[PDB]
Design a protein around this ligand. Sequence first.
Ligand SMILES: Nc1ncnc2c1ncn2[C@@H]1O[C@H](COP(=O)(O)OP(=O)(O)OP(=O)(O)O)[C@@H](O)[C@H]1O
Ligand SMILES: Nc1ncnc2c1ncn2[C@@H]1O[C@H](COP(=O)(O)OP(=O)(O)OP(=O)(O)O)[C@@H](O)[C@H]1O
Ligand SMILES: Nc1ncnc2c1ncn2[C@@H]1O[C@H](COP(=O)(O)OP(=O)(O)O)[C@@H](O)[C@H]1O
Ligand SMILES: [Mg+2]
Ligand SMILES: [Mg+2]
Ligand SMILES: [Mg+2]
Lengths: 193, 193, 578, 470, 315, 51
Amino acid sequence: PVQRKLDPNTPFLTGMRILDVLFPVAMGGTAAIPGPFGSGKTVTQQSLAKWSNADVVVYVGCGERGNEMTDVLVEFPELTDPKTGGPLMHRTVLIANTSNMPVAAREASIYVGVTIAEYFRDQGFSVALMADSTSRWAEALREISSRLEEMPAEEGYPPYLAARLAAFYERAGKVITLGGEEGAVTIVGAVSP
Amino acid sequence: PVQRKLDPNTPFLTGMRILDVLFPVAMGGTAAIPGPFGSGKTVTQQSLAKWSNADVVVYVGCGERGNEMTDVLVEFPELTDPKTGGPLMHRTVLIANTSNMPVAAREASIYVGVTIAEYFRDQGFSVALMADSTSRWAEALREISSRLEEMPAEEGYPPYLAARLAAFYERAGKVITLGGEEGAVTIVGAVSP
Amino acid sequence: MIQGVIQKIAGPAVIAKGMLGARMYDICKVGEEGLVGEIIRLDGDTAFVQVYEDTSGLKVGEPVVSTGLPLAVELGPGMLNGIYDGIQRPLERIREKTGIYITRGVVVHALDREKKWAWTPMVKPGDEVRGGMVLGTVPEFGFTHKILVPPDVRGRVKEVKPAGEYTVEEPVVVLEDGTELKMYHTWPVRRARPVQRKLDPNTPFLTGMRILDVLFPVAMGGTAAIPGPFGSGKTVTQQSLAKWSNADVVVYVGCGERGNEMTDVLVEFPELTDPKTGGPLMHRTVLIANTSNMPVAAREASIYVGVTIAEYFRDQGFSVALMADSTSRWAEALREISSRLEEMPAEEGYPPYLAARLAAFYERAGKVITLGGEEGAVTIVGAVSPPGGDMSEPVTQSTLRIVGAFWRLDASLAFRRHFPAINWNGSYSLFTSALDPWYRENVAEDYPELRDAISELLQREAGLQEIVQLVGPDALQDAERLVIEVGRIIREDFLQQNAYHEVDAYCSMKKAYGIMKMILAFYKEAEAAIKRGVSIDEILQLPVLERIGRARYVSEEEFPAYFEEAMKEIQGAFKALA
Amino acid sequence: KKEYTGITYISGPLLFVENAKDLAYGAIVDIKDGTGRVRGGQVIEVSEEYAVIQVFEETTGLDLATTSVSLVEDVARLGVSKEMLGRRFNGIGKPIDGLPPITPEKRLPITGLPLNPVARRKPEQFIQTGISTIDVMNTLVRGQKLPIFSGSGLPANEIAAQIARQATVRPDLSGEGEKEEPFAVVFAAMGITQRELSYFIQEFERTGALSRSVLFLNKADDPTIERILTPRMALTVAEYLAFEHDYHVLVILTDMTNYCEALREIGAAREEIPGRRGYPGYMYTDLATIYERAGVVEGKKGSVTQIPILSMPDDDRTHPIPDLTGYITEGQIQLSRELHRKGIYPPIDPLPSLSRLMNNGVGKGKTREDHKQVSDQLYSAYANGVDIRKLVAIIGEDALTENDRRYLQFADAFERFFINQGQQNRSIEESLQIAWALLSMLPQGELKRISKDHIGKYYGQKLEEIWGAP
Amino acid sequence: LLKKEYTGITYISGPLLFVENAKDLAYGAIVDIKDGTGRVRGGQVIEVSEEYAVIQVFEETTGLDLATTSVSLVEDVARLGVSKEMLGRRFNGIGKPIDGLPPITPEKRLPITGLPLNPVARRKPEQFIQTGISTIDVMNTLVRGQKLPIFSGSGLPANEIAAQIARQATVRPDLSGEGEKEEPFAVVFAAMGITQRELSYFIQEFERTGALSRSVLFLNKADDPTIERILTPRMALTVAEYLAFEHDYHVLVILTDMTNYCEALREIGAAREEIPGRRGYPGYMYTDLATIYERAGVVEGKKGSVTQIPILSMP
Amino acid sequence: RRVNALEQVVIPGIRAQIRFIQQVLEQREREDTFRLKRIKGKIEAREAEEE
Ligand SMILES: Nc1ncnc2c1ncn2[C@@H]1O[C@H](COP(=O)(O)OP(=O)(O)OP(=O)(O)O)[C@@H](O)[C@H]1O
Ligand SMILES: Nc1ncnc2c1ncn2[C@@H]1O[C@H](COP(=O)(O)OP(=O)(O)OP(=O)(O)O)[C@@H](O)[C@H]1O
Ligand SMILES: Nc1ncnc2c1ncn2[C@@H]1O[C@H](COP(=O)(O)OP(=O)(O)O)[C@@H](O)[C@H]1O
Ligand SMILES: [Mg+2]
Ligand SMILES: [Mg+2]
Ligand SMILES: [Mg+2]
């Protein structure tokens, strides 16, 4: 719960010229970055994790490769965050669920990440959340619906996928917390069509 | 029942240049006018009702707007019959079943219209029958067959749709009535794909 | 065996009860009329049997009897000179006993039970027998039909019948175990016959058609496919292969074609003559014929019967060529059968196991060492007919993944009366490397280099088509006009053939080598004369040029003198007049 | 005799009857109710507990208390005789001409038996249809299956009536002349309207063509099972006549699209999973059982010839109904909408037309020996002219050469005279004469496909003969 | 341990048979089906409940009947016996020899499914591998521990490129320093749906080069039953993982054609009445493909590595 | 230039569009077949509730 929601009015600085000048995103907004394989979604999200001005960064590796998590685990302790001067890993929380892990755990990882990000919002910080792929979550929903033997809507997906996606993205925004402080959560989700 | 059928040898004058010149329709024949929404089926059928050389016109509003039936109810008493010389509403019979009216009554509306048109044929008149949309009839059949739990045909329609459509169009023709007189029914049916 | 009664009839699907003990994919005789069908599903005490023929007129309560065996064929003497349907029913005896119509429930036997054969034993009591060994020989036309033990039988010989006249139903050798061996045995048509070892193909399959066996050859035991849009010359090529090839036994399979097309092959074949012996062509052929209105199960199982017969004749030690006509019709029959079973389709309505079946059919070919210790080979040539001529059709895609040779046709060359209308650009063969040692040891030591040179000369002609399409064909320089003219000569005298002439229908390798040598020598001397400087119209007029055209019609044993005469003539005209 | 009264379920076109295990599958039954009406039905499923009956026409007055079912016949049969020549039937054998029913010489099942492939012989004799673009370029051989492809508005019915009215055999060209040949026409129309029915009746009654013809006419508002049964009855009559009295029958099927749609409806009513594009998976075999009943039999003098007529749903040749017909039949005849809108009747387009058995019917001894070369030269010249006509509109007529303008004249003269014949009846000699007259406008040496012996005998004739009344 | 047999077969249709009173059958277990003739088929439990168990058969179901057929239990988890002496041997894709040599003795029995690697336990692939091809080693260089597929065509020489890479693969420990030592190398080769001609060409190339002495071949022909095509890459990856992570070998895994694997997966999935995907392929094909490609890489604190080069053709 | 532009740009795009539309229509047909199979199974299972 929150007290009130506020209009986003300060930019979220990502460190990339094209995303900061031409297509900006605010401090409580949501962004979607779709593309085919090899386009550069993961590199963009990791650059956002490295260089943005958010206080706390929560990265959700939903259904992707395991090397992309080992690179973050290895290279981050040797980097310096832009605003406090300490190690970069001291402000990062990783939720990892790779592609060869059980499928039904993909759905829970998104909710765990967004709940942790909301918890850090209640303390007054500005939190940036990166979801690595939502299409894997959609695939997990399709698998569960197929096991339940429900009638699909399109491409085998259950008809309530849009409601789940809207419920996930609506948790972002700049609010006034119950303690009287100001907090913010931004969500950048990547789609793999 | 009738006594005998007759060859089509007399045009059904509609007052439209392209229809009456390039694509004529006889007194006992049938025609169809399909097209997407906003292309002019209702305006064409209303012009046919206004300007044709038929003695009696039966208009069937199967599953269409109520504003068009209000337009017909208001404008027609102020017009003049081309041949009788009196008001235009004295030769017209309207059958209305709007889109918000109950679904199951659309087939009844079509059959009532065609039966009344057959009745006016037996008195020696030449009747014109306009069906506003026969696609809503098929949609009603699909809706009922959904509750019947039948095995559907292509696109979900019941398998007996073609028989009903054929049996509706075969009632038209230029006949010799049981009393020895001569009458005809011409049917124009719009399709909304 | 298991007996039951009918419980429910619904079209071709029949449910029988009391059939406990029946086995999956057995053959059942349904009803009192004797209709046949498979068992496709067992359930409790009931069995789902799918009848091949029409079930109209049947009643609930009629008996159903299971034969206890799956679909099989009888392999033995008498299969040669025969005409069979998709499930091995002799059509000639059906016509003799029924008339012009094929009535349902007709009962016939694949092998004639009343014909006597001269038995020549080759074993003695006390001998050991294993699968594939030879029990005896029996004369049949020009061959010696080796009577073989079935592959699943081993034991010791107890008693052997002496030489005499017997039928196929009488035992000739009885084992000590009590097993009685006749002249024939049955084998399931869906299971491959065992072999000792598969070999590597290195001997060519002599087609007799010059472009095929020169530019895109196929080896013994290899596989090939020949597709094409609509009428492109497919049937003439396959019957030419039937006549003029070096295969001892030819198996022709017609998978659900038009009735008049079956009439053509059924009437024209009994008039041809075998080039090897001079006797009738039908004395070494087995024909499988199915029209479109024949039952879909027979059309689907048509190719397996032919491949089983080919495997049997390979096991006897011969070399067999199997021609399957229009495998697309077989794929259509398979699609219909899958549609009757309510299976989820893939691609253009085909079942998702089409590639598995196509691989299972084509993998049976190859040169092997038989279980009796002899060599054998099966060669498969399968025609495909894509619907619109598109080569992206799933049947063509599945076939192209496994065939070693791929001869593509088109009707554009048929317009110009250029036969055989093989696209020399789109076609290819993967047997060229392995067949070269045979060519150099048995034809000529310089055959592959010369063939590669001629292929390069053909390739050089194609690259100039971007110039002749804009500029006229006469406004070119000498070095281009010469190669254009020699390409036209090659196309109209080497890549063209007729099979209605005695000295051209069957082309030996030495003849083709000589013609190729003459063409290359003419081109080389013309280029050398062009280097010296001469008008190119003189090159297109010199009388030696006609000897290339008239080298096709010399007799095969008359050829070498003609070749030497041309080789000495060509050295004369081009040195003085140029 | 025995009646079944255990009706337990009525819904749409089906009804279930209990304790009906004496009914054979596929039998024909009678459904009688309290009001005295009698309806027909066909058993589609037989079980130990009940049987399923599909009812002809509607099921309005039925009820579960008074309905009773009685068996009529185990196998659907048709009573045939030689008196059928000149009679009209409704599609299940009932006369509709007001004449009393015939006395049957035999009763035969309507489902066919496959011909033995070793019992057939090659077709070698042609049929004169009276249309130049068919008799010359796409010759129809006795024993051939030759479909006709048309669109929504093209005149297929008029062409069918004209072909049925004009077709005959030509024994005088067959050797020394042979003798009298019996000829007959079997006309089967499925799913036609009242206008087409009246037109067909008038056309067959106004010239005496009814005296040698049998008509099977099924209307659009008739039950669909009759539409399924009609072609099998027509082919049964044709086979009986041809192979028992040495007739040369000619079967014309008016609309195979209606048959395919009725098959789809029947399959849907029995709860079968459809195949490609909603059509049944066994449509290939069902179509093959109809087309493959034509042919000529060794040892017999009669023959059966079929001209199926089908309308492509969207002028699409990749639709399943035109696609499967191409695999079974030998060639096709395609009507063109351009020639129809340009005022040319019959609108037969020669370029996409093809007959695959023409080479066995042309030649000396059965027709004139210049048939094949004339047809090939006409095809090539028309193919050149149609492209030259399109190039003219861009580059102009003066920019052409002389032979280009000669071909440009030949193309439109050909379209105006050879094709646009109207209601004429042309013998093969007339069509060959007109074809030679059209080729005479081309210079000598341009006719590469014709031997010089024919050129020295037939070249150089003027076109003004047919010009008298085109 | 003494065996237990079930005779309660109640329904056979297509590739599925139902077994009654099968409470003590574990999920995913391997069963042996015997009929009256004594022939033995393979099968796997795919659904178990209180009333019956559902078993899919590894091959055709001809000859089965509800009277004489019996089902026995082989093992609850499918396992493969592995040993160091497999180097130089050939297998059919199910674990049985095809070169005529005596069968190997199992050092260990490992599950062929495998287990996911902990992302913490991994490390960065950081070593260059010289392939012997110029266009690879410069612009698209291959690193030890990478999964680098080759996108081929329908008439393009991919098999020859794979054979050349397998012949010329080296470690080159000179330029980054590394250990400057002679290091063992191995190649594990798996072929699915291969033809006789390609089989002969592959074995001839491996024999002529001499690389067969350090290789293991899992060769599956196109006429084999389709289940043996499914299990083929899993056994090869099990052998590669065992070698690399228990004997410090730098193994290289080559998968000849993934398209045949995908078509076999589609054919298997369509027989279990599941919702199709984009082109008729099953909807879980991403997970099934991921369980194969994710078994390569390097492990922190160990010397071995696994490198995968799959080859596939684009239709 | 016009000939090359047509043959190199216009035709392949139309071919790709045709292929894409064919794939979409085939997928929709397959989904319809699956739905019909499911409801046929439901109809068959309804009658077996109490025999
Ligand atoms: N900003 C960038 N600067 C330099 N190179 C880049 C950049 N973005 C992407 N690349 C290159 O392109 C590759 C794309 O890899 P990346 O993981 O970012 O792609 P992706 O779209 O997330 O892929 P996938 O869908 O497979 O997860 C990188 O490995 C790198 O080589
Ligand atoms: N003959 C005409 N002359 C002038 N305007 C016309 C004519 N026909 C149509 N229009 C215009 O186009 C509009 C089309 O609306 P209309 O009600 O005719 O559509 P419709 O095809 O019957 O659609 P619906 O599917 O909604 O019933 C008319 O409201 C009018 O503005
Ligand atoms: N080698 C050849 N010699 C002579 N004629 C040939 C040869 N190859 C093809 N043809 C001609 O090509 C034509 C093709 O006929 P056909 O085989 O029936 O075509 P398709 O079987 O493709 O429909 C035949 O009429 C035949 O005369
Ligand atoms: Mg990524
Ligand atoms: Mg309107
Ligand atoms: Mg052919």
